[PDB]
């Protein structure tokens, strides 16, 4: 007489892609390598009434 | 029996990684939404900004005084527009596009990149205007009180945009504070072809340079044409249940 | 016409050139790569204990002038640290076999009593449960069945009765750190512990020591008070406290500070300070001291203490196990 | 209360699945949906020796 | 008192003056707004319902 | 071995302020949280000393010893870069503290809060709504001096709390009020009224002082008794020749040997666990100084 | 450890986004009577007589029903705890003040 | 790191001055500074502790403490090696102290300034017209009832002095001659109590001690008086009893509110300052001890 | 007073003079010979990052 394992089961990991979800489509992308040595940005506009 | 737990270890210390990058790109997605949702302004006050009429003038005193007064009037009347759709009875469906298309008219659209063309629906044409995130529970009201789906699928870039300090913007980076993006439209325009008026088409080349170049390729998205738009529709509550978080 | 001016800089080169390499930090990562060797390198702890073999000391790289081996025979050592890793310094003791229990936890601290007797051989050493045998169903009776013939430890200790009414017991014993490894042997046991430093055990199927108090003894100050910071480290301490009934022997755990420390265990003793002060005592020249603390180590805060049983003989003991101890022992402060 | 000692952390090959089982299960172990549960963080999480 | 441009943004960028804690037993002040997700649409207009 | 902590602003910080913030370098203050990121909330001791409640320097001491400590490295206008100080590191510290003085070299730091002056230490960030209060770091044997005038300023100024005649004024200001360095008057800020934990660690002062007070040798009293009026010493100057009339009373006894020598055993454990009462804050060790580049080599 | 950093502008000038409160989905104050306790709020103020002011401290409640429970490790030791409450069939109590 | 020192001297060593440091070649010398390449005059305690000037404890202790120590390990002509001692690494350190005191693992070291008589510490080199001093080191234990056991035994000295009828000398001698620790008996020497004050390195030491003992009952009858409020400490109320009745009875009238402040900040200075001192500064831990080898390995 | 710092440590591609320029250098630079100095010792004599 005996007892018996019935299974072993885990849970499967999921990937989530940032470029893949909906919400990509409000925001434009660029890839800065060294951010890391930017201290400002700016952009500037000028119109005429 | 050492072997055996030579790939235990391994597979422990690899799966700590596929944890930490996992963790980066989540923190990525939310970045970006808490991004927007400090950006984004309550109905109630932006519904009136939206009418010319009453500010043609200016704020002055009194244009002031009208508006708080019909801040406090759509604050305390037309909040809480979904549960405000039950009552109503047949006039549901017809009050939603409405008080979603309200939505989208408050927002202002005129932005830079007017000309891009970053995302377009899965049958042709149709770019697509914007996106409405949303829970998961409400995701099904509305997909029942607008009816069926237009095209269920978007197109859009599949990498990002690459800028490079490479060149004469390396020399003004280490001599002076200063860079520059696109030193080449400013030397071709400043000094080799001065006095050229510039034109809306001569200078969209320039404007959207780098973000129009990467291929398509489809996303899983849930599009509805309220009038004039094709909008995207989606719930990003399915990363927060299982990362044991807070939507 | 290459006048020989001073040291050849070609050979300074070569020789600052070992020196320079720090030890290796902030990998970048690409999910491109989604692993590389590189980062294997940074993760990799790279341990001691050999095989014995002639070159399997020199591939594992033992015999390295530094205090932790480090391998790659002349390419290794460039580290010249690990964040200031430690090795352990081990204490040995010679001592009784029928005063120390084997049944005991590798990893509960151990007390030393310092002997007034010169040139002895062999020292007496004591465990928390075994301290509570010699100052005297819970602690007792867990206490009783580890140890029985109460008599061969109050003959370890022959001024036990006058070195607790002067209030000059503690300073006779010395807290030394948990138990790492235990020598079986019929008449002499071979003891050994780690005094300072990462409390860490010497088994060759190598596995993780976690210091163990039992739970009657162990009182978090924390959340017994219960912005305001929260640190990394936190303390262990023990205290040895003369009452009416006998003299004690309990635990505390937080992370405030020395100055805060000391404060709060005059508000946790001031109902036992009133009532051995009342007309139960009088006043006398020796007979004024309370008690004295001392601290252990640190280990970390947030988390790092759990709490199991500890099983002899068909009966159990509630018990706390510390994670990770550090040991860095202070000597005592009186309070009052 | 019923908790662990039921459990054996033995490094068994499991076998993966597609359900999710990641809902609501905090709150579940908090309150008790299962007894003869674990949960190991951090450096725990890893198996076993033999 | 600032241009009301200044209270739109300042109203979802910021949260207002000690605002109370949720899911406690009895409302604190928030301090830390690590999961705090609040608007409080009363303290532009400054009234009572 | 990688020890560093950036502080993201919620909103840009001003142009005038960036000049502030920079002259700040390598100044240690205290962060709540030891994590590579973290928010503006926890940086300064301001969670601590608030414009609105009444300041504790006793509260501020305690929190000091609690937090993690970190020093200045680089300022931009959204993000300050810091690193943690651990117990196993050394680290360069420089002397950028409002209320000027010159470290010894080689001599032993003493981190404090701000004593002689709110507005001092204040870089106040009216962009992100928030005041930054750094800490003040004084060589050891000042730091003391400066902990004993304002413990000492709670008990007297109890007593002569409020008199209309110039009994306040006459030491309390005059002794307590101010510390005086080489060629120079630092004026301290005197709380005017303690509630919190100023009292509570005196309280614990006056517990070694009524056990102490039976413990004194009386082989030292009847020393004194002659020296005051025999011999003339510079430290005997403080009593005129008259000596206290308590000494004539608790000097009646004769001498025992027997007996001081278990006094003296007795006061100096009490003495030793005393010096864990008086610091009440951390204290950093130097190896080195210059005073041309006001960078010191903290421990 | 793993760290990320990005940076973010604005592609045009004005309002880009506008969120909106939908559908309520829960009340969670309970909207009761508790009001807030002044004794705890200002602890230190108090009337001249001991005795007058332990009988109006014991007659309008604040020692078995106050909110922050004061003894030695709040005056001593300066730490708040929260008092009592075992049970509650509305929600999170909402102060009331005067 | 590197922790290494070499002492070049200006003209060589005798062969008797060779091996008079020979025998203290495993022993704990302060340094002047931690660079690689120093001179002799910095290196001993003889800067300090000089013939032309009158010794005193407290700056002994102030020097040892902020200090660098070393550790002896060749000797040669025209030459001395040493190695740092710097926190994170164990040492081997072997017992050459004249006053030989045994030891015990797992001890706590005490460094003291060398309180026996100068030609026990010293080692004199009449090449290079220095003399280095060495700091004892010592079992903590020991260093406690040898400190005050000194520090009274010239208390009484000066009693005995000032007038005969105060004590006997035979007694004085009985009792604080000896010293017994741990089974073993050790006899310290006496020194001679010069006459005068000045003198007598300890004399600072001791005025410290006995000025704060004759001010502790006027203050801390002034502290416990001044911190009666509605709630205090539990204890404050109870230990107020305990105090004798010869202390209570003074009233704080007698003084003016004038010195009161200047006899409460005198007595507060020395009591801090004492505080530190009879924790015994510098100490290191021991792991291990052989009486064979006498090497202790601490760190 | 003489503040003396408006000075730009940017990494340059600098030009070599024979030109001693270390007569009185240290000496000048204390009594203050010229505004707009900077002085860097040790780790700070590196080339400047960018």
Not at chain 5, 14 to 22: D, E, K, M, Q, Y
Request: proline residues 5%; glycine residues 8%; negative net charge.
């Amino acid at each position: 007489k005996f007892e018996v394992l019935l299974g072993v089961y885990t849970n499967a990991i999921q990937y989530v892609r940032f470029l893949e979800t909906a919400l990509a489509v409000s925001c434009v992308n660029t890839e800065f390598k060294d951010l890391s040595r930017m201290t400002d940005g700016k952009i500037q506009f000028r119109i005429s009434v | 029996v050492e072997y055996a737990e030579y790939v235990g270890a391994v597979k422990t210390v690899a799966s700590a990684l596929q944890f930490g990058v996992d963790a980066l790109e989540r923190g990525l997605i939310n970045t970006v939404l808490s991004v927007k949702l400090r950006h984004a302004p309550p109905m109630f006050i932006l519904q009136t900004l939206a009418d010319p009429t009453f500010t043609e003038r200016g704020f002055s005193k009194t244009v002031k005084s009208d508006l708080i007064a019909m801040f406090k009037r759509h604050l305390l009347e037309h909040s809480f527009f979904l549960d405000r759709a039950e009552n109503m009875g047949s006039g549901f469906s017809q009050y939603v596009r409405s008080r979603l298309s309200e939505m989208v008219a408050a927002v202002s659209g005129e932005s830079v990149l007017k000309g891009v063309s970053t995302y377009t629906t899965a049958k042709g044409g149709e770019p697509v205007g914007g996106v409405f995130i949303v829970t998961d529970n409400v995701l099904r009201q509305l997909l029942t009180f607008l009816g069926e789906e237009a095209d269920n699928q978007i197109m859009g870039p599949s990498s990002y945009a690459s800028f490079v300090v490479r060149g004469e913007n390396l020399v003004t980076a280490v001599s002076y504070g200063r860079v520059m993006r696109t030193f080449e439209h400013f030397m071709a325009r400043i000094v080799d072809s001065p006095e050229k008026a510039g034109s809306t088409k001569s200078d969209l080349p320039a404007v959207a340079a780098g973000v129009e170049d990467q291929p398509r390729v489809p996303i899983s998205a849930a599009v509805i044409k309220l009038g004039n738009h094709a909008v995207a529709v989606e719930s990003l509550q399915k990363m927060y249940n299982d990362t044991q978080s807070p939507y | 016409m290459k006048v020989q001016g001073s040291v050849d800089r070609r050979r300074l080169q070569r020789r600052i050139a070992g020196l320079l390499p720090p030890p290796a930090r902030r990998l970048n990562i690409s999910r491109g790569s989604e692993f590389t060797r590189d980062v294997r390198g940074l993760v990799e702890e790279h341990a001691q204990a050999s095989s014995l073999s002639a070159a399997a000391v020199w591939r594992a790289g033992l015999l390295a002038p530094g205090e932790v081996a480090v391998a790659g025979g002349g390419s290794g050592g460039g580290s010249f640290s690990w964040s200031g890793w430690r090795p352990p310094v081990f204490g040995d003791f010679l001592i009784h076999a029928s005063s120390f229990n084997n049944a005991e936890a590798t990893g509960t601290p151990l007390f030393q009593f310092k002997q007034s007797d010169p040139f002895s051989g062999v020292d007496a050493v004591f465990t928390p449960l075994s301290l509570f045998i010699l100052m005297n169903g819970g602690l007792t009776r867990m206490a009783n069945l580890l140890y029985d013939s109460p008599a061969t430890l109050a003959d370890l200790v022959p001024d036990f009765g006058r070195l607790v009414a002067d209030r000059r017991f503690h300073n006779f014993i010395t807290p030394v750190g948990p138990l790492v490894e235990n020598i079986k042997s019929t008449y002499l046991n071979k003891i050994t512990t780690v005094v300072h430093g990462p409390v860490v055990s010497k088994a060759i199927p190598r596995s993780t020591v976690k210091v163990t108090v039992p739970q009657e003894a162990f009182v978090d100050l924390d959340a017994w008070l219960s912005l305001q910071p929260c640190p990394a480290d936190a303390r262990l301490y023990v205290a040895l406290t003369y009452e009416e009934a006998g003299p004690r022997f309990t635990f505390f755990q937080s992370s405030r500070g020395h100055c805060q420390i000391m404060n709060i265990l005059r508000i946790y003793y001031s109902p036992s300070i009133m009532h051995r002060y009342a007309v139960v005592q009088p006043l006398h020249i020796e007979e004024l001291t309370f008690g004295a603390v001392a601290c252990l180590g640190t280990f970390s805060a947030t988390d790092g203490w759990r709490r199991s049983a500890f099983n002899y003989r068909g009966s159990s003991l509630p018990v706390v196990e510390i994670d990770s101890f550090y040991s860095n022992v202070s000597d005592w402060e009186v309070i009052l | 209360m019923a908790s662990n000692e039921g459990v054996e952390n033995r490094p068994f090959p499991y076998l993966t699945v597609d359900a999710d089982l990641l809902s609501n299960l905090r709150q579940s172990a908090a309150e008790g949906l299962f007894h003869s549960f674990d949960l190991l963080v951090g450096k725990d999480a890893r198996e076993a020796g033999i | 008192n600032r241009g009301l441009y200044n209270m739109v943004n300042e109203y979802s960028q910021r949260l207002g003056g000690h605002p109370a804690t949720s899911n406690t037993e009895v409302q604190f002040v928030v301090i830390a707004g690590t999961d705090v997700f609040l608007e409080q649409p009363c303290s532009f207009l400054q009234e009572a319902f | 071995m990688d020890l560093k902590v950036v502080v993201s602003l919620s909103s840009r910080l001003y142009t005038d302020e960036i000049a502030k913030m920079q002259q700040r370098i390598g100044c240690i203050l205290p962060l709540a949280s030891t994590h590579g990121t973290q928010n503006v909330q926890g940086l300064g001791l301001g969670q601590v000393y608030s414009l609105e409640t009444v300041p504790d320097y006793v509260s501020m001491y305690n929190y000091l010893s609690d937090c993690t400590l970190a020093v200045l490295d680089e300022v931009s206008v959204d993000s300050l870069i810091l690193t943690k100080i651990v117990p196993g590191q050394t680290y360069a510290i420089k002397n950028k503290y409002q209320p000027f003085f010159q470290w010894h070299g080689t001599g032993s730091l003493s981190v404090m809060p701000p004593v002689f002056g709110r507005e001092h230490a204040t870089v106040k960030l009216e962009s992100n709504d928030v005041d930054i209060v750094f800490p003040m770091v004084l060589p050891t044997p000042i730091a003391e001096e400066v902990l004993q005038k304002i413990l000492l300023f709670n008990v007297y100024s109890r007593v002569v709390m409020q008199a209309p005649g110039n009994a306040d004024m006459l030491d309390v200001h005059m002794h307590l009020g101010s510390v005086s360095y080489l060629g120079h008057h630092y004026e301290l800020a005197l709380p005017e009224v303690p509630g919190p934990l100023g009292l509570a660690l005196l309280d614990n002062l006056s517990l070694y002082f009524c056990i102490m007070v039976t413990l004194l040798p009386r082989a030292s009293m009847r020393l004194v008794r002659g020296l005051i009026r025999h011999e003339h010493h510079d430290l005997l100057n403080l009593f005129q020749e008259m000596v206290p009339d308590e000494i004539a009373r608790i000097d009646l006894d004769d001498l025992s040997v027997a007996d001081d020598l278990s006094r003296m055993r007795v006061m100096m454990t009490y003495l030793q666990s005393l010096a864990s009462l008086f610091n009440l804050g951390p204290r950093l060790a130097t190896a080195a100084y210059s005073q041309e580049t006001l960078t010191a080599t903290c421990w | 450890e793993v760290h990320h950093e990005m940076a973010s502008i604005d592609t045009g000038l004005s309002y880009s986004s506008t969120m909106t409160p939908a559908r309520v989905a829960a009340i969670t104050t309970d909207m009761g009577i508790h009001t807030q306790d002044f004794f705890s709020v200002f602890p230190a103020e108090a009337f001249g007589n001991q005795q007058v002011n332990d009988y109006i401290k014991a007659k309008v409640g604040a020692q078995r029903n106050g909110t922050l429970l004061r003894d030695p490790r709040t005056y001593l030791a300066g730490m708040t705890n929260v008092n009592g409450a075992p049970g509650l069939c509305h929600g999170q109590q909402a102060t009331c003040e005067i």
